[PDB]
């Protein structure tokens, strides 16, 4: 689960979304979703689900951006997909490039201590997967 503050950008309105507004609103938003062959491409949220409060923990990544995950949360990586509590300062994710749009790998600067925060999870149609602060998460 993703917790709140989690920023989700929607490729069609260009539109920058926190999660916990996209679930709280049941808004039907766009994500940016990756496919098998790790191309990415835009897909509609078909469900929204409010978690809870739950520990979560944070990788900031090259650029700036952090996202805070419960350990569990899948990410994906050069590697393949990994929960986010096995990461660890140096190992490369998978990412959406601002400026391109492209797939590419960032390597995660630091892995934030864990906390209690209010989580969420959307349904991404088709592929299962969405671009959450830039990075590439199993959804
Ligand atoms: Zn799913």
Known sequence: ?????????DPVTGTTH???????????IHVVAAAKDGTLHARPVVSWFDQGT????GLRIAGGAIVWATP?????????????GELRKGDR????????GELRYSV???????????TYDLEV????????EGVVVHN
């Open 1 to 9: 689960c993703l917790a709140e503050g989690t920023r989700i950008f």
């Open 18 to 28: 926190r999660i916990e507004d996209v679930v709280d609103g049941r808004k039907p």
């Open 54 to 57: 739950r520990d979560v923990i």
């Open 72 to 84: 569990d949360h899948k990410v994906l990586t050069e590697y393949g997909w990994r929960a986010a």
């Open 93 to 100: 994710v998978a990412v959406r490039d601002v400026e391109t």
């Open 108 to 118: 995660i600067r630091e892995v934030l201590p864990t906390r209690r925060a209010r």
């Open 125 to 132: 149609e088709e592929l299962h997967t969405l671009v959450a």
